[PDB]
Design a protein around this ligand. Structure first.
Ligand SMILES: *[C@@H]1O[C@H](CO[C@@H]2O[C@@H](C)[C@@H](O)[C@@H](O)[C@@H]2O)[C@@H](O[C@@H]2O[C@H](CO)[C@@H](O[C@H]3O[C@H](CO)[C@@H](O)[C@H](O)[C@@H]3O)[C@H](O)[C@H]2NC(C)=O)[C@H](O)[C@H]1NC(C)=O
Ligand SMILES: *[C@@H]1O[C@H](CO[C@@H]2O[C@@H](C)[C@@H](O)[C@@H](O)[C@@H]2O)[C@@H](O[C@@H]2O[C@H](CO)[C@@H](O)[C@H](O)[C@H]2NC(C)=O)[C@H](O)[C@H]1NC(C)=O
Ligand SMILES: *[C@@H]1O[C@H](CO)[C@@H](O)[C@H](O)[C@H]1NC(C)=O
Ligand SMILES: *[C@@H]1O[C@H](CO)[C@@H](O)[C@H](O)[C@H]1NC(C)=O
Length: 321
């Protein structure tokens, strides 16, 4: 008495009907699992009187999808293009993914969804701002522009721009923030005492209009010779003419800008309103020299208290403390 045993379990297959034993004459069918294929197709077998199932040539392997390793202007992540497998897509910079970023090989051996393509990122022609003009801009894609392209607006006269003057085509197909462009007037600048001021002869003064200053002979400027009307409606600065100082002493050696100078030579025509110098004083306890600062401020400069006129030895010739 001979039955056939439970059939062998082959990779990626099913048997039907699966029983634990078979009478001679019964039939089984081997089929590859979905997504798998094997040469020769199904195998049918009849359980023979010997009870021994015959050799099984069946060799199930995963269906293979069409080759998809080359995404023009992009990159595919894959191991193999077999049935269960999934593949990923991305694009090189300047390109976008037109389609799904992932795809699977199906039981039918197709890619699902359909493989994407990489397309160049494009911006439409940029909008020009009110009271603005386009200085430089040329389209590199017909009437449209490509990624990282730029345009810049110069704002037309008497108008001040707010925000960067250049716009860029971003990775999304749009431009960066546009500049705003308003008109700005400034008041007339105040004439300084002991000085003069020069500005254009016209009823109203606008942005980047320049007024220039000057001082009379005993005075110099508190600030810049030239100013201009700014974005905010005030001026760069508003300088005064301050008074120079007469040299305090007749003969002295002082420190002016890190160098030691003779004050009657360096300032033979007076000290200007900025000018600061350092006088030399004697520490009698330690028998050495030190300095103390003094600055011309609107016609006044005060010599330090410790200064005994360079008229022992001069303070400036004594060793430092
Ligand atoms: C230029 O494109 C950019 C791309 O984002 C776009 O956002 C939508 C408005 C829509 O048009 C969509 O199709 C685009 O993807 C815009 O720049 C910014 O992009 C951010 C990143 O995607 C986006 O985000 C968040 O930003 C803040 C977080 O601080 C949140 O408040 C916001 O609700 C989002 O969650 C951001 O929204 C977006 N900027 C704005 C103002 O929405 C940009 O708007 C667009 N236009 C211009 C003129 O630059
Ligand atoms: C020119 O003016 C700006 C703007 O300040 C304002 O100007 C007027 C419109 C008016 O509203 C004032 O009360 C404002 O102060 C000056 O910028 C200011 O600078 C300091 C720095 O902290 C401070 O007062 C404010 O933070 C700044 N203004 C704003 C609006 O934030 C600027 O200093 C002026 N320039 C000169 C050369 O005076
Ligand atoms: C791009 O140029 C003009 C816009 O200046 C437009 O009318 C034209 O149709 C565009 N080119 C083509 C080939 O359509
Ligand atoms: C904006 O303009 C400044 C100077 O005009 C420039 O240095 C800067 O790079 C610009 N912004 C960007 C994002 O490039």
């Amino acid at each position: 008495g001979r039955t056939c045993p439970k059939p062998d379990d082959l990779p990626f297959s099913t048997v039907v009907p699966l029983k634990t034993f078979y009478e001679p004459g019964e039939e089984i069918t081997y089929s590859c699992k979905p997504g798998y294929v094997s040469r020769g197709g199904m195998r049918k077998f009849i359980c023979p009187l010997t009870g021994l199932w015959p050799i099984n040539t069946l060799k199930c392997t995963p269906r293979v999808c069409p080759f998809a390793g080359i995404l023009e202007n992009g990159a595919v992540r894959y191991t193999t293009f077999e049935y269960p497998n999934t593949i990923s897509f991305s694009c090189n910079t300047g390109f976008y993914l037109n389609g799904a970023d992932s795809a699977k090989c199906t039981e039918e051996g197709k890619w699902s969804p359909e493989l994407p393509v990489c397309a160049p990122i494009i911006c439409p022609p940029p909008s020009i701002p009110t009271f603005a003009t386009l200085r430089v801009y040329k389209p590199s894609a017909g009437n449209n522009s490509l990624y990282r392209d730029t345009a810049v607006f110069e704002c037309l006269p008497q108008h001040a721009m707010f925000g960067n003057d250049t716009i860029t085509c971003t990775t999304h197909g749009n431009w960066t923030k546009l500049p705003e462009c308003r008109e700005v007037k400034c008041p007339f600048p105040s004439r300084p005492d002991n000085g003069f001021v020069n500005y254009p002869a016209k009823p109203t003064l606008y942005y980047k209009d320049k007024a220039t200053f000057g001082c009379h002979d005993g005075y110099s400027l508190d600030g810049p010779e030239e100013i201009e009307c700014t974005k905010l409606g005030n001026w760069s600065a508003m300088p005064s003419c301050k008074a120079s100082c007469k040299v305090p002493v007749k003969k002295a050696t002082v420190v002016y800008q890190g160098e030691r100078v003779k004050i009657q030579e360096k300032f033979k025509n007076g000290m200007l309103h900025g000018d600061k110098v350092s006088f030399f004083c004697k520490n009698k306890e330690k028998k050495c020299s030190y300095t103390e600062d003094a600055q011309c401020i609107d016609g006044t400069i005060e010599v330090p208290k410790c200064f005994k006129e360079h008229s022992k030895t001069d303070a400036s010739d004594v060793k430092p403390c």
